[PDB]
Amino acid sequence: VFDVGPRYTNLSYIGEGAYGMVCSAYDNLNKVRVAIKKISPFEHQTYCQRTLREIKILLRFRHENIIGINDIIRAPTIEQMKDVYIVQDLMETDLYKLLKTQHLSNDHICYFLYQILRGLKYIHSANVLHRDLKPSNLLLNTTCDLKICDFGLARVADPDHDHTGFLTEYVATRWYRAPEIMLNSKGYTKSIDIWSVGCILAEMLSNRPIFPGKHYLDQLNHILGILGSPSQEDLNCIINLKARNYLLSLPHKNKVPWNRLFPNADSKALDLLDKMLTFNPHKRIEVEQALAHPYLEQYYDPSDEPIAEAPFKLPKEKLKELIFEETARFQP
């Protein structure tokens, strides 16, 4: 059932999640094809929490490089509401699908990275962390416009409560996890997102994930296999003993040079990659510095890289109520 009939017809499948499905459909009013995400999350608490945080963020954000919500279709009452349909701009593909078969020119890598960071500056300026940046969450159209999507794992930044023990369970996509997630971090600081963007840049350069860990700790071992052993200064940040002693137990490895991994890459792109893929999250480049890096000089313009107008400062039955309230503005 794809019940968007008042004005949306001719549905064609796009993809799915544990609690929803994305389709493409014709908008009988605006005479344009749109994307519609059928979301059926109400039978699972986790699905409800992710749906609510995403709707709340996406309705507040307004940025060219972030997917917006154009319409929300749902029943007029909580009792009758089984599914929620989110209508958004249609994007022809995503960076995951594109990198499966297409080599990117250096100009495409530069422009796509610029747009990722431009959108990320806005996100971070609202004190929000995306926490699941990866190629499939970067939507693209035929004119190379890029929009970040999927804010289901997003959180408000909380650096004071970022500390955790070694091997703490984590939900976001393994291959794009910063090394500190496995060591001592809950992923509540902006540096978590910069690491993922660095992983995406490496993937745009080679068409393959840079750190394809097969399981939790294997992820850290792929990272260290390229970065080499953390320095004494970076080990100064790792004060939890189990994490520290795990790193000290590893054999010494020197750094794999970026120019050996990416021999066809622009040297300025590799200098920016190095700064994004910095082991110490405190030394890792921040989004505004990355925009100002020489690799992005042809696009950089801080006056045209807007920030958010203000920061973004439960059982499944109650979460369903809040989803109903949050979607009320779209009822006629």
Binding site: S105, N106, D107, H108, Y111, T143, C144
Partner: peptide
């Protein structure tokens, strides 16, 4: 290369 975006 100077792609027109």
């Amino acid at each position: 290369a100077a792609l027109a975006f």
